[PDB]
Amino acid sequence: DEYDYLFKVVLIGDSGVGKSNLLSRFTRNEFNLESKSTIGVEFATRSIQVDGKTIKAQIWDTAGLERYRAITSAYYRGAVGALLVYDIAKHLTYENVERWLKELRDHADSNIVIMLVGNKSDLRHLRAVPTDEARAFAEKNGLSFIETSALDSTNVEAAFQTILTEIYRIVSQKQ
Amino acid sequence: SWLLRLFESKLFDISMAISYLYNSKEPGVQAYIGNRLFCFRNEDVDFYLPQLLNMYIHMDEDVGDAIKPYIVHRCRQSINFSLQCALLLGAYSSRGTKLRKLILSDRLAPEREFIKSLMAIGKRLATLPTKEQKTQRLISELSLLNHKLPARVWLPTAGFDHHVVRVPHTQAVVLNSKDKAPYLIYVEVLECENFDTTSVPARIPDPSAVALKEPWQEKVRRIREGSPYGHLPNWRLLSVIVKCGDDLRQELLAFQVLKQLQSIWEQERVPLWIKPYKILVISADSGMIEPVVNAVSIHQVKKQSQLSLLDYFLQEHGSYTTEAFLSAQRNFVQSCAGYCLVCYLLQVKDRHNGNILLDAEGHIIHIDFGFILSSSPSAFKLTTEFVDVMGGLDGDMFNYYKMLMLQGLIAARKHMDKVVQIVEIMQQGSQLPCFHGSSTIRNLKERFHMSMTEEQLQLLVEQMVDGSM
Ligand SMILES: Nc1nc2c(ncn2[C@@H]2O[C@H](COP(=O)(O)OP(=O)(O)OP(O)(O)=S)[C@@H](O)[C@H]2O)c(=O)[nH]1
Ligand SMILES: [Mg+2]
């Protein structure tokens, strides 16, 4: 039969933070160290089940580069979920998080669920962003927060199922 | 996922790590390896430090930024590592100037003043055209360094952390009568667990001070008995050759190749014998070399004893039927084959009896590995004398010598890339004469003959032996 819900979730963030690999690890449990730049958008999907209700998660990995930026702003439309991904080894990607927040609040819904993701946690010795600071920033702006690693699959499904169940909670409570 | 399966497999050592770091143009890979460097044992990465810093200096900033965190951390950990880094960065730059100055600025003052003092002393001996005059002024100059000791000063050519406390100036000697003459010195030090932890020892103020041509052990006993620090169980004696006017970079490369080939032959259970001596590059025109004890050049042997090498073997180790002569002959054969393979692979030129050393056991030890690979001033030869020592052309030991060469050659083939890598990475942006040709690496690769079978390698060894005579 039919799904109970079709959740639209977009992956946004600076180019190179590891969105495509987070997506590939969540949907196909695969990883590639030599992943090339995403051209426009990449589509993956996964059906989860929450509270007896079936929910198909349509996930769109958007391109971090400006080249396809406008095209990535058309996938903000109708999106109930958004993962703002940065790199813990590159501080600049953490700096642009606010900009991604602004753009997300410019081209998407105001009631969208935002999950702050700090990818590449396996690179312990290359860390440029402390967890406490990022958590503080996430809590200060009413965002979810989690540090992931697509390489060793740490907190990937945790992040996705977290934002998905949160979305389901928000949808159900408003009904 | 294959590559990730590889990087996390048991096959992933510092060698392959640096290989991929050198070849890959993927930022994720560079970052992964840059973080992975922290997971390797310090002594494993230390051997490849010159390659790493060379990559930092003469390659794109992605590689350099990938390597930089590890180098910074290690520099924060070890002051010796900081010194080595500053030296190698200075010597191989003609980018890392800022990093070098950052390392020097941090503490390193006593060490730099010490080294500069030694080099200054080395330079001041030019006004004396003789070995003995030079030696006299050397002892005089060194007699004025002990007043500045002890201090946060050490010899990087030692395999342990320590503080320099004394210098038996009377025991020092200049090695030749050339302009920038290298000089040998002995240094009394005190070994600690960690140099960065323990501070400097206190100072404590004509029987022993006579310089004789005695063995290393007797030198140690003599110097220690007359030393104010000698009663300490902490006390240990070191020895270094200071070269104030000698580029030792090619020597360092050759040292790495030697260590590698040694490791390979040990792994493949091939009884070849070589003796790599530590090299300390201080600049592009100066450095230090840890000498091999109880060993004198073949020339010095045939000059002091005035005998042929075989005669000297019969005088020093006994007649043909003695155990000592047989053992010494075995050592001679194995060392000869080993350094034959070394000279063939590295294309070592300027080979004479002034460069070939001889120790008490009967090993030969090639030194002064300048003019290798492409650079040429005269390669290694098999003189009648060496064959006479090995017992003749049709002898068992000569056949065993050739067979040792073949075995070591096959062993080298089975681990060729690990040797080629060392040279290939150092070639990057190098102004060294040993890279004068545009195809040094190609020729090096060709000298391994990977396309040949074992029979063809046998024929190759036969041709090589025939040609070297
Ligand atoms: N160590 C480690 N490396 C990662 C991780 N995730 C991604 N990478 C590496 O970072 C590089 C970039 O990852 P990638 O997934 O292509 O970023 P992206 O955000 O999708 O890039 P784009 O589509 O916005 S342009 C890749 O080479 C990948 O190997 C991770 O979790 N841990
Ligand atoms: Mg991508």
Author numbering:
A (entry chain F): 6 to 180
B (entry chain E): 128 to 221, 232 to 243, 306 to 404, 512 to 683, 691 to 782
Please give sentences taken from the publication describing this entry.
In this article, we describe an application of hydrogen deuterium exchange mass spectrometry (HDX‐MS) to identify dynamic regions within type III phosphatidylinositol 4 kinase beta (PI4KIIIβ) in complex with the GTPase Rab11. All deletions were then combined into a single construct that contained two internal deletions, as well as removing the N‐terminus and the C‐terminus. This construct, referred to from now on as xtalPI4K (HsPI4KB S294A 121–784, Δ249–287, Δ408–507), enabled us to generate crystals of PI4KIIIβ in complex with Rab11.
The higher resolution crystals of the PI4KIIIβ bound to GTPγS‐Rab11 revealed novel molecular details of the PI4KIIIβ‐Rab11 interface. These crystals revealed formation of a helical element (residues 70–77) within switch 2 (residues 72–82) of Rab11 that was not present in structures of Rab11 GTPγS alone. To examine if this conformational change occurs in solution, we examined the H/D exchange information of Rab11 in the presence and absence of PI4KIIIβ, mapped on to the structure. Notably, there was a decrease in exchange in the region from 72 to 80 within switch 2 of Rab11 [Fig. 6(A)], and there is no direct contact between this region and PI4KIIIβ. Intriguingly, the combined crystallographic and dynamic information from HDX‐MS revealed conformational changes in the switch region of Rab11 upon PI4KIIIβ binding. Switch plasticity in Rab11 binding interactions has been noted for a number of Rab11 effector complexes, specifically in Rab11 bound to the motor protein myosin V,30 as well as in the complex of Rab11 with FIP3.42 This intriguing observation that PI4KIIIβ changes the conformation of the Rab11 switch regions both in solution and in the crystal structure, suggests that this may be a mechanism of how Rab11 could be biased toward binding specific effectors. The fully optimized xtalPI4KIIIβ construct in complex with Rab11 formed crystals in the absence of small molecule inhibitors, and crystallization was amenable to soaking with a variety of small molecule inhibitors.
